[PDB]
Design an enzyme around this catalytic site. Structure first.
Site, mmCIF file in Angstrom:
data_model
loop_
_atom_site.group_PDB
_atom_site.id
_atom_site.type_symbol
_atom_site.label_atom_id
_atom_site.label_comp_id
_atom_site.label_asym_id
_atom_site.label_seq_id
_atom_site.Cartn_x
_atom_site.Cartn_y
_atom_site.Cartn_z
ATOM 1 N N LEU A 59 0.847 -1.182 0.000
ATOM 2 C CA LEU A 59 0.000 0.000 0.000
ATOM 3 C C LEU A 59 0.885 1.235 0.000
ATOM 4 O O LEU A 59 1.849 1.312 0.768
ATOM 5 C CB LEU A 59 -0.924 0.018 1.215
ATOM 6 C CG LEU A 59 -1.948 -1.108 1.306
ATOM 7 C CD1 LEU A 59 -2.387 -1.292 2.740
ATOM 8 C CD2 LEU A 59 -3.140 -0.828 0.412
ATOM 9 N N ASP A 60 0.560 2.194 -0.853
ATOM 10 C CA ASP A 60 1.360 3.403 -0.960
ATOM 11 C C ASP A 60 1.432 4.070 0.405
ATOM 12 O O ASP A 60 0.678 3.704 1.315
ATOM 13 C CB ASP A 60 0.770 4.353 -2.003
ATOM 14 C CG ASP A 60 0.630 3.706 -3.366
ATOM 15 O OD1 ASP A 60 0.339 2.493 -3.423
ATOM 16 O OD2 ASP A 60 0.809 4.412 -4.382
ATOM 17 N N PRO A 61 2.320 5.045 0.594
ATOM 18 C CA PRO A 61 2.472 5.635 1.930
ATOM 19 C C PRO A 61 1.192 6.197 2.513
ATOM 20 O O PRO A 61 1.004 6.107 3.730
ATOM 21 C CB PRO A 61 3.516 6.732 1.700
ATOM 22 C CG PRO A 61 4.328 6.232 0.576
ATOM 23 C CD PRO A 61 3.389 5.479 -0.320
ATOM 24 N N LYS A 62 0.304 6.765 1.701
ATOM 25 C CA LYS A 62 -0.871 7.472 2.195
ATOM 26 C C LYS A 62 -2.137 6.620 2.189
ATOM 27 O O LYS A 62 -3.225 7.152 2.429
ATOM 28 C CB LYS A 62 -1.104 8.737 1.369
ATOM 29 C CG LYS A 62 -1.087 10.019 2.180
ATOM 30 C CD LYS A 62 0.290 10.302 2.752
ATOM 31 C CE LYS A 62 0.351 11.676 3.393
ATOM 32 N NZ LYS A 62 -0.744 11.884 4.378
ATOM 33 N N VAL A 63 -2.027 5.321 1.929
ATOM 34 C CA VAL A 63 -3.177 4.447 1.732
ATOM 35 C C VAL A 63 -3.317 3.533 2.940
ATOM 36 O O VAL A 63 -2.362 2.843 3.319
ATOM 37 C CB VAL A 63 -3.035 3.623 0.442
ATOM 38 C CG1 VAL A 63 -4.230 2.708 0.261
ATOM 39 C CG2 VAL A 63 -2.872 4.544 -0.753
#
Lengths: 64, 92, 133, 347, 358, 90, 61, 128
Positions: E100-104
């Site tokens: 998961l991307d950093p902001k997800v």
RNA sequence: CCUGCGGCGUGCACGUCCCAACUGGGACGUGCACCGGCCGCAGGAACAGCAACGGAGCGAGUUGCACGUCCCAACUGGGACGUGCACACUCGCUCACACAU
């Protein structure tokens, strides 16, 4: 002694140091009567308990 | 008499003539175990160890001309490193 | 202040026969009137039990509020066997006040004497009429 | 409720006597077995075998010791042996499980039972609010260091839960209920609760309110009841009071996982044989290796306590083997006939 | 009469016969579910006392063979989360399937030191996201957005975000909400592994004719694990470790960590005898002479889970025999090892003592 | 050199001139586009849509405007900057 | 943040941007609390949750 | 209203102020805002000040979700002997702090200007 | 041949200062994560045995309490005089060595 109790609707022991329970009735002491093996009052206790319906046999049987 | 000393823990509170110290080292002290200061000055002996198995306290019986009001917040206490046991010993 | 109809409700299920209010006044007066002679009125569970065992005749007054009941549930039957009339009192503290000791006693043994012959006879007669369940 | 002669099946399976309860909920390996006329139901044993295979839930008095309350029962009941499964201090009342004769074999198994006490603690100085005491009890939870009261081998014992039932500020005397592991010293716990609260404290009264699965509501009887029951039996030949006072030992194994065995396997197990799969009539979900189980006959009796060497799935997927090894035989030998060696092969 | 009296006076003995012994295994945990419905090849073997049930392992082995469905916090990266779990639990190895991307936020399956062998098998798992998007310029009405989404349901074309154009599928999609005043919508998407939903949002914008971008993303399911399937937060992991290291309590750690077999409940099962477990661990192919049970529907070149009779996932294998063949055969290799999950020497070495082997 | 028909004008997402695709070949990234007269109008910016029926959005230079093209306007693309569809198929 | 949700009768998450659910109750934020690995408040977090019956061990199943 | 707002709050929203105690709390926060260093607002500042050892009263907002952002601070306050009480909503706290933006929690120090009200609120909370 | 293991300056969190939400901005220090094929090491080369010769039951070793009789000043606490009552291994005996129709 200090530890007394009363009972709720489910017949469960609620422990308190108070001489009067929330409902106004007295609190029963939590400790059993002192026992001495040389006790020759078995017949007398049975007579009185039976007269007032407090014997173990007179109560409804358990559901084990 | 104390050949060596290690910091047992920091200061806690006072309960009458006793000084509860919060122990940081995991090792559980011995009973009647001398608690010294930084300069190897015996002040008292351990009396009761209570609390959980990794965050616990120890009460000391200040004896030879010492007081509870003598020590103060943030003070540190020492103990003989040989008078300890491993936490594992006491634990299952 | 606590009444006499609620105080009786506070007693246990084995406190029968229980002296009515008028008979209650009478027994308190008898105990006060008899406290005078030290050795003609016994106090205490052990003492009353001992005197009953050796067979001292008189009247035995119990305390209605007792718990657990297993400390004195055998005494009514012993009194019945030995033809020693007995009755219960609404509360133990009332008995303690009756003796003026401030420490209510579970049971009292009241014997007969000339000074209080009339009151003793009246209380005994009232108790006998009350009956045993 | 139920007429005296109603068939046993007319009562739901959830109302059977103490080890047959919910037997239909168990996994059935086979129904086919040859019932034998031997043995007795746990609650229909004669009076001479009820006492020998029974336990009492005594409400211990205040002054006498636990070894003196157990000797008293032995003398009263004229039984050969009597034991108990946890020592209550001489000044401490509460539940005390007293095993009679053949039931004493379970005493060891009852040593690790979780206990529940109701303690009274007096604080030397005062606190500002009951919230202080509640928080202090909260931090005196989990595994904790304890020293036996006046050996001295600091031990670690767990307080699973606690709850300050009452507190009197004028007296500085409080009552708290504690769930703790076997061996916990509530005297030391009160001292430590005093130390934690910065005022000191001590235990001035104690009462065990539960010992394992047995409590004050579960058929607790005073010693007066035991004495009265014996007098009724000797002078009146009435076993109603005595049967109320004494309960079968099967009431101490109701929480154990069950493995019903055939009538042909009972005597072999009583002689030291291991519980084997070909003799299992029914087994219970949730049996894991190295788990203490109870072997039960088809009448509800407790043949033995065993250690499981096969999980429930393993029993469901095997035709033979050692389902469990013995830990403590309860049933007496020769209660059931010797019927081992007459199987399908007998070769 | 009272039920107590009837209990003391009645017979209450198990009836001598009922004529049926059906098992009800529909409630047994993990890989033992519907254990009776499996085709039974044989019931004859000698079980060994080695091993534990997946849920009743010791704490050390339970942690070493476990996984956590972690609600990923918004700010950090997935690898930070994996490393944080490692430091908290003091474990040698840890991994995760999907990144998961950093902001997800959302589901994040983290393996612990032996479930890391199942990370590769979890990479192709389906993924359900719930994504917030903002459109650059307002649209006519919501039906336009619904139609635009209905046009992006297929083997769509996606290039990674900030370049090998790939093809990734979007099985389902739904416009859960659309606030017109702010032009911000929330849509739920079921998609194949590797799909970049930010690319999908910009493509949905392009489709609407106004353009758009992704503001937030929240993975609501990774494979067979979702939000209701025992998802726990990072605070839960830290608290559970603390309760075990201070109060020596394991219940919290057991609610957090779950047996690795929970990831293999969708696989067809082949139960093997306890004499064949160590052979399989060392690399031996799953041979027919040691199969107790199998699940119907097994096809050639299909991923199955080799399990013990206790419910432990010995390995992941690829079948080389159908269910019909496995019922109608006496020898031959039933499956070929793909990933040995069980640690060696957990069971004793018992290969080579049989009749034909000698 | 030569060109082949890419598709027709479908809509416009800001600068991007979205061209629907009728061919079965998918172009590259920034691949130059040119009209009938081989006049370059931009480079490929994005490639979205279903696998077969898909679209490409192209970024144009400053000398051209997206609205400058009318509905149905057809586009040409390089036949030397295309990939086989079987490559991108599974 | 943007995402929020409310629980229907069956227990599923119904996602929305609204602050108030159709039933009048607040909508719970979809995202978990931020995590600091150097968090020294584990004891204080198990006490409060246990006191109010929120800890994982206290739930069924 | 007020009962409704307390209904919406989370289960850890105890002890809770009634309507009258809530008006007193908002008055206290409004009075304390005049002094820059004598009112602490926000999660980080209040947590940091509690760690250092600052004293006073901590007021929480019960309508916060997820609760793991603040569930520990009540226990920290109990450990350091800092009175605390929840309030129905964060918007009310914000409105009383001269900021439409909501405030999850606040910490009020003692100043001679509002000694009486701070001591009234402290006594009322301590009796709950 | 099979398996296990290893190799082929951005952000994040914390602590400290300035300003103008469950926040975004700046600065200073700490820690934390990232920008299919081949090779090396180790384990094994596996057709999955075992329907009883180690289990059980006994015995040994490794001051308080109750009653009665007296003195005294609650369902009592004190004294005295007597009564009774409590304070995991090895070594021996016996039973079978059991797959339960």
């Amino acid at each position: 002694m200090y530890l007394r109790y009363y009972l709720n609707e489910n017949g469960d022991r609620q422990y308190t140091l108070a001489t009067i329970d929330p409902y106004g009735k007295p609190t029963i002491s939590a400790h059993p009567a002192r026992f001495s093996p040389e006790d020759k009052y078995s017949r007398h206790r049975i007579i009185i308990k039976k007269r007032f319906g407090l014997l173990l046999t007179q109560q409804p049987e358990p559901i084990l | 008499p104390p050949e060596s000393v290690i910091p047992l823990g920091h200061y806690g509170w006072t309960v009458q003539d006793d000084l509860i110290c919060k122990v940081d080292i995991e090792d559980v002290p011995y009973f009647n175990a001398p608690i010294f200061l930084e300069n190897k000055e015996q002040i008292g002996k351990i009396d009761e160890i209570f609390g959980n198995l990794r965050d616990y306290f120890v009460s000391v019986k200040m004896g030879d001309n010492f007081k509870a009001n003598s020590f103060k917040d943030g003070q540190q206490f020492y103990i003989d490193p040989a008078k300890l046991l491993p936490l594992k010993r006491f634990l299952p | 202040p606590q009444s006499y109809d609620e105080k009786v409700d506070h007693c246990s299920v084995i406190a029968k026969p229980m002296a009515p209010k008028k008979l209650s006044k009478k027994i308190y007066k008898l105990i006060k009137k008899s406290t005078s002679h030290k050795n003609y009125i016994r106090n205490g569970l052990k003492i009353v039990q001992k005197q009953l065992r050796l067979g001292e005749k008189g009247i035995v007054f119990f305390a209605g509020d007792i718990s657990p009941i297993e400390i004195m549930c055998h005494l009514p039957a012993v009194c019945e066997e030995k033809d020693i009339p007995y009755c219960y009192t609404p509360s133990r503290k009332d008995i303690g006040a009756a003796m003026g000791t401030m420490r209510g006693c579970v049971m009292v043994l009241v014997k007969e004497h000339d000074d209080y012959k009339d009151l003793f006879d009246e209380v005994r007669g009232e108790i006998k009429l009350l009956g045993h369940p | 409720k139920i007429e005296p002669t109603e068939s046993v099946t007319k009562l739901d399976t959830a109302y059977w006597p103490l080890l047959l309860k919910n037997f239909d909920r168990l996994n059935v390996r086979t129904n086919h077995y040859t019932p034998l006329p031997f043995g007795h139901s746990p609650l229909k044993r004669p009076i001479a075998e009820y006492v020998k295979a029974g336990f009492i839930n005594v409400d211990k008095p205040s002054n006498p010791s636990s070894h003196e309350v157990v000797s008293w029962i032995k003398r009263i009941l004229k039984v050969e042996k009597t034991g108990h499964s946890g020592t209550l201090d001489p000044k401490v009342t509460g539940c005390l499980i007293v095993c009679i004769d053949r039931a004493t074999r379970l005493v060891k198994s009852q040593q690790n039972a979780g206990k529940e006490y109701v303690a009274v603690f007096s604080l030397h100085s005062a606190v500002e609010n009951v919230k202080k005491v509640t928080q202090g009890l909260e931090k005196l939870r989990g595994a904790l260091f304890q020293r036996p009261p006046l050996k001295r081998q600091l031990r670690v014992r767990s307080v699973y839960d606690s709850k300050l039932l009452d507190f009197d500020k004028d007296r500085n005397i409080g009552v708290f209920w504690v769930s703790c592991e076997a061996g916990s010293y509530i005297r030391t716990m009160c001292v430590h609760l005093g130390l934690m609260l910065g005022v000191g404290g001590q235990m001035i009264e104690l009462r065990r309110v539960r010992s394992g699965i047995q409590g004050e509501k579960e058929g607790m009887v005073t010693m007066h009841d035991i004495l009265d029951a014996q007098w009724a039996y000797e002078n009146h030949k009435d076993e109603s009071y005595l049967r109320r006072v004494i309960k079968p030992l099967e009431g101490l194994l109701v929480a154990h996982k069950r493995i019903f065995i055939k009538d042909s396997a009972v005597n072999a197990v009583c002689y030291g044989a291991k519980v084997l799969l070909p003799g299992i009539l029914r087994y219970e979900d949730g049996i894991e290796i190295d788990q203490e189980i109870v072997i039960v006959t088809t009448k509800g009796e407790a043949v033995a306590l065993a250690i499981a060497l096969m999980t429930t799935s393993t029993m469901a997927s095997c035709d033979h083997g050692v389902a469990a090894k013995l830990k403590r035989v309860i049933m007496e030998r020769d209660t059931y006939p010797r019927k081992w060696g007459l199987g399908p092969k007998a070769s």
